[PDB]
């Protein structure tokens, strides 16, 4: 067809933070479509990929991926907490990111 998307779009909002101290080890993700923790409970444990590009070709590609997963819900509005192998570079606040449907329970 014309669409081939097998993931859900999301936005990298910020780190986990207090009013004046942030914590880069936990990122905050807005998954689009979900507006409550009860709907966000479907997406727990799903893999997340941040997909970006670079000028230098490394192993056949100019596209590099950072992997992570959803761990828990955050707040009352469907924001989730996500942890990555290496933390997200904080210039990606507001950048798009992919939530895959695996590991599936359905």
């Amino acid at each position: 067809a014309e669409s081939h998307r097998l993931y859900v779009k999301g936005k990298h909002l910020s780190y986990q933070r207090s009013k004046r101290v942030n914590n880069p080890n936990v990122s905050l993700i807005k998954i689009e479509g979900v507006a409550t923790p009860q709907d966000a409970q479907f997406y727990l444990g799903k893999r997340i990929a941040y997909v970006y590009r670079a000028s230098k070709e490394v192993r056949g590609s100019k596209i590099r991926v950072m992997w992570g997963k959803v761990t828990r819900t955050h707040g009352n509005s469907g924001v989730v907490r996500a942890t990555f192998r290496n933390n997200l570079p904080a210039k990606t606040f507001g950048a798009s990111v992919r939530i895959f449907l695996y590991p599936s329970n359905i």
């Binding site: 669409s3 097998l6 993931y7 859900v8 479509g33 709907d39 997406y43 449907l101 599936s104």
Partner: protein
């Protein structure tokens, strides 16, 4: 090894006899009967990769005949069950993709 044996059928969408992981599929509610297929031939030793040595490096750049007539035996038994209810051949030939406005936590498969 906790894997699922699946087939396309190969005549429909070109997916051969294969094994997949159960955590990487979505079980839809659409059900066909697979009684009449003799799948006890296949096992974990049926799929062997014949592991490659470290010396054989592919600088620049086939199929088992046993595998291809096994596929031809099973898929002709599946498609007879496919022909009963309408539009299943078209459904299995078409691909799945998420459109704009599809919420997977609300979708039923």
């Amino acid at each position: 090894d906790n894997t699922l044996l699946v087939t396309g059928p190969f005549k429909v969408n070109g997916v051969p006899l294969r094994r997949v992981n159960a955590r990487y599929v979505i079980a839809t509610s659409t059900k066909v009967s697979v009684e009449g297929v003799n799948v006890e031939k296949f096992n974990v030793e049926y799929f062997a990769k014949e592991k490659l040595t470290k010396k054989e490096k592919k600088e620049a750049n086939e199929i088992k005949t046993e595998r291809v007539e096994d596929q031809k035996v099973v898929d002709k038994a599946l498609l007879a069950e496919i022909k009963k209810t309408p539009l299943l051949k078209q459904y299995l030939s078409a691909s799945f993709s998420l459109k704009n406005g599809d919420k997977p936590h609300l979708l039923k498969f």
